[PDB]
Amino acid sequence: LSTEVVHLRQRTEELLRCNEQQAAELETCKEQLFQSNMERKELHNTVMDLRGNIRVFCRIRPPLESEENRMCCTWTYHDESTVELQSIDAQAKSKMGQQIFSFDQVFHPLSSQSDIFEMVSPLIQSALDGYNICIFAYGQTGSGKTYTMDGVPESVGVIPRTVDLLFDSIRGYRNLGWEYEIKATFLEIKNEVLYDLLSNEQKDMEIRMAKNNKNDIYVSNITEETVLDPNHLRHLMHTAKMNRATASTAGNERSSRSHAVTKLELIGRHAEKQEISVGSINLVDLAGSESPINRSLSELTNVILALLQKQDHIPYRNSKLTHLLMPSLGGNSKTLMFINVSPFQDCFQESVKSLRFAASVNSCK
Amino acid sequence: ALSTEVVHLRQRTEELLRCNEQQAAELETCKEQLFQSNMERKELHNTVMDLRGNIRVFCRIRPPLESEENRMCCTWTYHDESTVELQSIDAQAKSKMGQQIFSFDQVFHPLSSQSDIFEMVSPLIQSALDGYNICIFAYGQTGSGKTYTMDGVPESVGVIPRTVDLLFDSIRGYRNLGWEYEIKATFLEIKNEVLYDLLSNEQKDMEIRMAKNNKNDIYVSNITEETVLDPNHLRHLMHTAKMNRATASTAGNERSSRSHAVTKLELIGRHAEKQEISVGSINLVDLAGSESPKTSTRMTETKNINRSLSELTNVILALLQKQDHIPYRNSKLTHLLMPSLGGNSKTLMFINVSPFQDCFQESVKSLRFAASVNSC
Amino acid sequence: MRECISIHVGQAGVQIGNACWELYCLEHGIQPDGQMPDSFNTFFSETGAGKHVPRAVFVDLEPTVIDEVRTGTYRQLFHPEQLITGKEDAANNYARGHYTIGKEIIDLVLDRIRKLADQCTGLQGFLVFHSFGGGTGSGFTSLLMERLSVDYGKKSKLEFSIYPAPQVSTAVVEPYNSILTTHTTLEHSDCAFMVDNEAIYDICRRNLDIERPTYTNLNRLISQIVSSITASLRFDGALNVDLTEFQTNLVPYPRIHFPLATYAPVISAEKAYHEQLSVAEITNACFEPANQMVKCDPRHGKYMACCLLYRGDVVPKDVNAAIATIKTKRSIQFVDWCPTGFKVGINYQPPTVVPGGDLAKVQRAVCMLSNTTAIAEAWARLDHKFDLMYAKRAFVHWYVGEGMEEGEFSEAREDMAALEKDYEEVGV
Amino acid sequence: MREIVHIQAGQCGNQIGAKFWEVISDEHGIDPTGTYHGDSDLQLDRISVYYNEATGGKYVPRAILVDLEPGTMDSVRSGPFGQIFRPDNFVFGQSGAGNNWAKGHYTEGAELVDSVLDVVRKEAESCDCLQGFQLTHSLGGGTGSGMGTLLISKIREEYPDRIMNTFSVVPSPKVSDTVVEPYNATLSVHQLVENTDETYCIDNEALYDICFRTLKLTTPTYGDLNHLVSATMSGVTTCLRFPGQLNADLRKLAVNMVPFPRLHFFMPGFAPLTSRGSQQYRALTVPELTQQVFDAKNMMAACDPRHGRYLTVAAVFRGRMSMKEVDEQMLNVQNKNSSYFVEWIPNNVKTAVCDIPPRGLKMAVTFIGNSTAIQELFKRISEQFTAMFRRKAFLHWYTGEGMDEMEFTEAESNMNDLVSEYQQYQD
Ligand SMILES: Nc1nc2c(ncn2[C@@H]2O[C@H](COP(=O)(O)OP(=O)(O)OP(=O)(O)O)[C@@H](O)[C@H]2O)c(=O)[nH]1
Ligand SMILES: Nc1nc2c(ncn2[C@@H]2O[C@H](COP(=O)(O)OP(=O)(O)O)[C@@H](O)[C@H]2O)c(=O)[nH]1
């Protein structure tokens, strides 16, 4: 009986040695995984910068069933990045000159929601790289800004799609050591006043410089929930839209004029190493661009153009929305802009007002 | 304490065997992830190259000597790191040539040394680590610094010594990835539009022939291709070429400074576990001097030397303009380097210029067509 | 004696010189042998024996046309050692004529011209006749011009090159040779007179009324031009003007030295009877754009200078009246800074018509050496043709393979562009 | 004096060269013996370019006769103007290529190239300043292709400065005379695009059209067919052999014709082709020659130029004329046919007016057109070559001689690149 004891005595010794080398070899490859992952972060960021700026994106939406009897405009498509619109009124056709606008890409009414998410997928990685991102939906009332951001259950918007991609990478990144916590704040900018979409307990809210980063901004008293899974955030967004008090039935102006800011801060901490990231994505659904308050909308127009001019001073604190996005409008980060345009002659004067902003972007950048 | 040891160490066997299986399964997962992790940056990095380039033009101006700094030198003006302005001091040259401003990817100061060149080595070897046919070109006149940057000096080595050192330690990391890389050294010379061998003194007939596998893959028959085993062996391979390429360079300017040496290091990476084979090649190619042909003793082949440069200039312009057909076969150098010049392949374009006034005109010729690449 | 010599490179140069020296020996009663059965001393180095050897240096890279002149009636007229022959033509290439055959015979030609110069007592200048699209007439001509500028410099180098016609180019590679030779000759030619083949074709069409014009008639006209130019030296007149005064009177700046020639009395024998050939009418005729020897509209550009050479029974009062009337003309535009350039070359030696020619016996003849702004557009379109050739890099392989680089082509193109800039800033 | 060496490969090349030498002797008034009896001393001026001086005032052609079947030259030797050749020039094998380029380039070529190379050097050193070599052969058979491919490869590597004239007879598009002429032609053009720098493509089918329709001939004998080629080819060099207003040569047109080294395949054309009885109805002036020589009806090649663009046009003239007419008429066709001319080469016409016309004629024009219509001929051959390639038809005859199948891919691939350039430069 003593013979088998000796046989397992060396078996214990050899299994200790095999596992010790197995673990030691494992950690070397594991460290190689970390160094291989961090270079991919910069490459993704570099591509965005080499692409220039991810602003100047027009999305034309098709007329609805109730909009079949409305009169359209002459939409002229050029290649895939330039679009021209002309009024059917030939009397004004000779007086309009050149209503030509060139964009980074052009989306036509036949583009599905997944087409928009193609340019929204790469920035999600950039958000994971500790960089602040924003998505702006801009245009007149009825253009389709809410459909681009929120959409419908049949064709989900960017907000449902960003969460699915965000969590898919996070679980895959679990093999890469990093652990992430998702913080969701839902807020509405009605008129230079901040309203919480996650609580009915009306209080006063103020914006102050961050305690650990003077260039960063935190919102006081905001409800900041930890997102566990896409089911949790989907419930959180449902609460926000119900609490938003959608008065489109009676008094649509109140609901429309209010800006909708969705901020999703990503925090990444890596044990056994050093890693600090506060990258956030601000999915802001901007209000109507119709001519008349507009303090937030007008300042957002000026701040964006000033940044392209490399202006020495930016009036970030000139409005609540611009000051809310003061750290979300920096130089190192990358900005997106969606211009939703109604394909109607009655909106032709409003359509050109949505597009000359982009015409002033590329001419300034 | 014997019967109890039987059960306890049997439990230890299960505790370790479970750990054996626990570590084995995720060891495959971590190795599998690392392949795609390196594959993700593999397609991410060339995208960075594609947006900013895939035909990269770099200019370096060499510093004048202690006695040559007192020698007349054209004014050097650096608007930024990417644009350089050279102005002829002569008033008559100013009235006709005017302002000579040129735009490139990056401008090298005479005091930049080889630091930023080595900073360019890491992205370009990564493209080679991506299994891409990458080529570098050393264009310029005699004494402009082509030999100082390619081969280098003992105190500050050139690109060739730096590339070999960094390549060898790089593949050691991929040896931890289960990748076995076979690297092949090929040396050849293009003088008088006929190829020779640097590693062999025997006069053999060389001809350009497409490889059996693919038409786009090119080899040369009867070459002395050597399997590289270690750096010191590879270092000796390049060292053996110098004395075989022994000819007048500055004293007579007979064959050297008017010659095209092609140094191709074909890397063949293999992964036994995942049956994946990565095929790449680097082309450490230096170009002949672009001086106007004035040596009437042998001016006939200098035109062919100029023809290779002219055809190469025609080829690179064709790539930029998206020309359907590119005249690769008009010259031996372009035809041989066709795999590394078209498609996904990426070219560094390094030009050397001289700061002296007498070389201002030849410097202008170097800059304008190199800047023409950046324009398109 | 302020004697001068002439050079002939290219088939154009050789044919032109043949017709020219034929006219010359006709002027002074010189037989084809070389004797006359002083005035002629300028171009003829007459020895003690009756052999008035011409001061001509005929050079060609192929022996065909030189053998032809060695076969014609003037073989014994010319000194046999003067005629320098190559073996292979420059073949439309500035490259060949400037690098591959040019320097392989330039030693012999320079030795011959130096021997001629030491023969001359008082050297006046140099005359060269060539083409632009011609490989020899570009490469060899530019190499010889720079060589003579190095050797002498102070002497007068005069070019009688022929312009490439605006609508027809016999050589498909004319723009390359033209641009290269202009770049390499701009700083080595004192003054380069211009003549165009298409313009003289139109002139002999509508004025000579000849339906079958050959190169012989063009050479006759060019010989008349050169005879008018050299009459002031070969003969006495009221106001003799030599080649030295030409650079003073004509060129305002060193770069702008491209005047164009014109010949007014170009009527035929039949039309001679219907006209009296007065000084005023021929003076007006020489200002007609249709009578210009270069295909351009002088009405579209201002004039820089006007050198007038009169020969025959002409009165200075008539010339003064004609120029005064022209000063009052509207279409004749001028620049303000030089409002008095009308230097006259009045002479009383009537031109002589060759037997079997197309010109008529005219009492008085005038040779208009106009310098005007009307060549800027011609240079612009020549540079445009060069850019069209260079954009696709067509034919560049030959030149880069026989003596140059495309960088040098860029240098020549930008030099022509700078010349255009200087021309247009002078014009305003 | 810019002498030219003549080489004839294949029986077709031998017959064409015999016709060419007989018409040249007609130009210079040379009997079968070699005694000169002409009247114009201009013949003696450039008699050296084709005839070597011989004792007793005789002359011999500077020609090399190469073949693998001895019988062909026996007819040439027995026929008129056969003894005019120096007998040492007759170099031949005994086996015979048998319409197989495999034999003519690797086995029979290797054993015989040395025999012809030495006599080439002997003739080459018998000259003052050599101008170039003219090769007469065909792309159909093996002797005319195996010899030519080897010789042009050989001659180039020791005479790089010289120019190469290859008078290759391109296979007919429809009336095929060889089951495997795609194999000969495709392998032939591989060496052509690498070594020579000017090639004249001639098609018998189009040549049949010239005699049957333009000349309204009824008996298209090869003697008549070769006569047109011989007359066309002599006009190419008349500017070199005779004086004129613009004395050109092969060097003159060499730079003019080819914008790029590879695009050196041209369409010959001879203007004066009045029928047996139509000469009375037709006046003979510069005009009629101009439009007649610019017709697809008159092209020696079987390609319609209207399908492509004239990259470069040459026009060599013979006889007495005023160059003003040729000036504006070349300008005239340059305007009316602007679609047929490449846009980025304005005024793409070369004129080489000579003085002496052909005997029995007053004016003559030789047309050398480097149009882009050639690519339709190559794709026809490319389609025919690839039709019989993957089915491996007759492959054993070529493969069994000692060449790899990938070599067939080289010729197919390289010639495909030649095709791709034409349509690229067509736009
Ligand atoms: N006006 C005029 N021009 C002529 C005459 N003969 C030749 N030319 C011009 O001369 C040019 C011919 O080229 P050349 O000057 O002879 O040059 P080349 O010696 O033949 O050398 P390549 O041009 O390379 O062949 C043509 O473009 C004609 O315009 C002539 O008799 N009168
Ligand atoms: N014009 C002409 N063409 C010929 C003559 N004889 C043969 N050919 C052509 O040449 C081809 C024959 O191939 P060839 O080269 O002569 O065979 P090889 O000598 O054995 O190589 C055929 O396609 C014919 O079209 C001839 O007398 N005149």
Ligand SMILES: Nc1ncnc2c1ncn2[C@@H]1O[C@H](COP(=O)(O)OP(=O)(O)O)[C@@H](O)[C@H]1O
């Ligand atoms: N591509 C589309 N297909 C169908 N309906 C759309 C589309 N885009 C927008 N809509 C309609 O627009 C409405 C959304 O209103 P929207 O125009 O986004 O408000 P806002 O004026 O704030 O942008 C939805 O009810 C939807 O039916």
Ligand SMILES: [Mg+2]
């Ligand atoms: Mg909305």
